[PDB]
């Protein structure tokens, strides 16, 4: 009543990641009933931090009664991105596709990868564990969802303030490099580069061999898409090691010489303007529908054989097609030619007409 | 009599928001009779502050005998904007449209949204509450009116002094961003951008992901309408989340290819001059009457189906049509194409001939 001063502080900040927790599943943060979403959530936030190099933000957790008593929503920067439904006390199990037999569990879905799911009681673990199922506790069904959301939205999770912390962690290793890098690219320019690297989900663990490449290639162009190409050409090793396995033989698609040429025409035309697009899209010659059609099949065709999906392109089209594979197909990999080692021999599968 | 020095201080300042309180309803601020307009008014000024991000001004309250003993006027920056009439002691109830039955209450109107209203005694609440009505105390009839006035005039409520407080509240989060933003856009330039964002009523809660976008896009253009487009493309998520619901399917209008083209002609023509208008209006080819005619129907046609009103345009016409929907229709939403996610599939309703 005597809040007679309202101050800007009364306005609550917004947070990058936040969890909404409905009634039936608030027995997960209460610090007594073996709160998983203070360790399991840190489990993901660590076993993914140390993997992608930069400390992922702190997942905050709130419980808005506004929603159904047994659901949760994950919010990126202000508001929901994905919203799942948790069974009251029936643990979920997944059948990868090699498991056989079913259990009495109520059908559901996998909120992570859109797989069929059965929600089984706490006792039937044996029947799941002895039939070959992939059972998971309640909290993990969330934590895996948060992991997928982080791994997808990696870009927006990298703030204009980590670019300070990255240079700190890099001065710890090569203290003379940053002192020569920060004077070559102002942090506004650096961040765009890390954004372009994290969009296509490239790990920034070995920051030295990344600042080295930015410092090198900074002379020619300060464009943050020509720079993100060079860093990827320098990380070709870990790129392919993460996309495909250590098997030297490699299977991938390739652009159809016709369609591939048809695009380069568009880029050259748009080159009339001052590269109005960086490379994300210069021209939409109505083949965008053809793409939005094939790229799902392109993922699925290679998912008729089990091998991970990859796609080869010209380097000049590399940065473009990354945007499509980032929106249309939830899973893909667009690699250039020079981004693949001369060690791993590749095997084209076919064109795309 | 010995006020022999008259000093500039004797001149009373003017205030952004101020309330006028006639006789019959001064029993609302007197601090004894459960003064609602020191808590309810703060109720709105808080549950709207924390929503739109920036601390709304302090509503001042005065009682000029000049007016009828039972009316009130709300004043923005010097003088009345809206003026309501309060029944002596008969509480008002509203029938949303789904409620059935009437009560003895004297007819009136809803000062908020122009709805039919009945003013009932304090006892008939049950008959209202058991018939399905929306009854409200005297003070709330005001407080809701103040809320509507704030939510409409948000722009003029954002002073050239908050741009200091916004950077303070943003240094609290990303202290290295402002120190790199304030050196990129002088506060005179920043404010115009926040003005353009608040005109179409976009929340500024997540200031980090807004300064980030202004800092980014500041290289190309310092025009505060090309900047307000990029911030909205970056907030597309919360934009649509606030206009429509979380339902992925979406229904909206679209410009008639003919009329849409007819405007772009006008913009290109005006491009002869140095973009004499930012984008609010380059050319009035007498289709302004057609607009002032349709936009009311455009609101109402979609109010024949209950779904919230939206309108799609070209991005190059986006900033223009925002001015019309800000004046002609008290409620509308003009969204571009790139301002809508690729997640929510849209459903056009029809052109506008």
Residue numbers in the entry:
A (entry chain A), B (entry chain B): 343 to 695
Original authors' sentences:
Type III secretion systems (T3SS) are bacterial macromolecular machines that facilitate transport of protein substrates across the bacterial cell envelope. Most building blocks of the virulence associated T3SS or injectisome have a homologue in flagella and one of the most highly conserved parts of the system is a set of transmembrane proteins known collectively as the export apparatus (EA). The FlhA/SctV cytoplasmic domain is known to form a nonameric ring underneath FliPQR-FlhB/SctRSTU, but the full-length FlhA/SctV complex remains poorly characterised. Open and closed states have been described, with the open state being competent for chaperone-substrate complex binding, while the closed state has been proposed to be responsible for binding early substrates.
Out of the identified proteins we chose FlhA from the lateral flagella of Vibrio parahaemolyticus (Vp-FlhA) and SctV from Yersinia enterocolitica (Ye-SctV) for further studies, as both could be produced in large quantities at high purity using the gentle detergent LMNG. In contrast, Vp-FlhA was found to form the predicted nonameric complex and we imposed C9 symmetry for particle refinement, resulting in a 3.8 Å volume of the cytoplasmic domain but little detail in the transmembrane domain. A striking feature of both structures is the N-terminal density of the cytoplasmic domain, formed by FlhAL/SctVL, which reaches out to bind to the adjacent protomer, demonstrating this well studied interaction for the first time in the context of the full-length protein in both flagellar and injectisome T3SS. In both of our structures a hydrophobic residue, Trp350 in Vp-FlhA and Phe367 in Ye-SctV, sticks into a hydrophobic groove on the neighbouring subunit. This residue in FlhA has previously been shown to be involved in ring formation of the cytoplasmic domain of FlhA. Comparison of our structures with FlhA from S. Typhimurium, St-FlhA, in the open state and Sf-SctV, which is in the closed state shows that both of our complexes are in the open state, with Ye-SctV being the first example of an SctV homologue in the open state. We simulated the movement of FlhAL by overlaying one subunit of Vp-FlhA onto the SD3 or SD2 subdomain of the closed Sf-SctV structure. This demonstrates that adoption of the closed state in one subunit would affect the neighbouring subunit, potentially propagating the conformational change in a wave around the ring. Our structures are not affected by crystallisation artefacts and are in the context of the full-length protein, suggesting that the open state is the default state in the absence of other factors. Our structures also suggest that at least in the open state the residues known as FlhAL/SctVL, which have previously been described as the linker between cytoplasmic and membrane domains, do not form part of this linker but are part of the cytoplasmic domain.
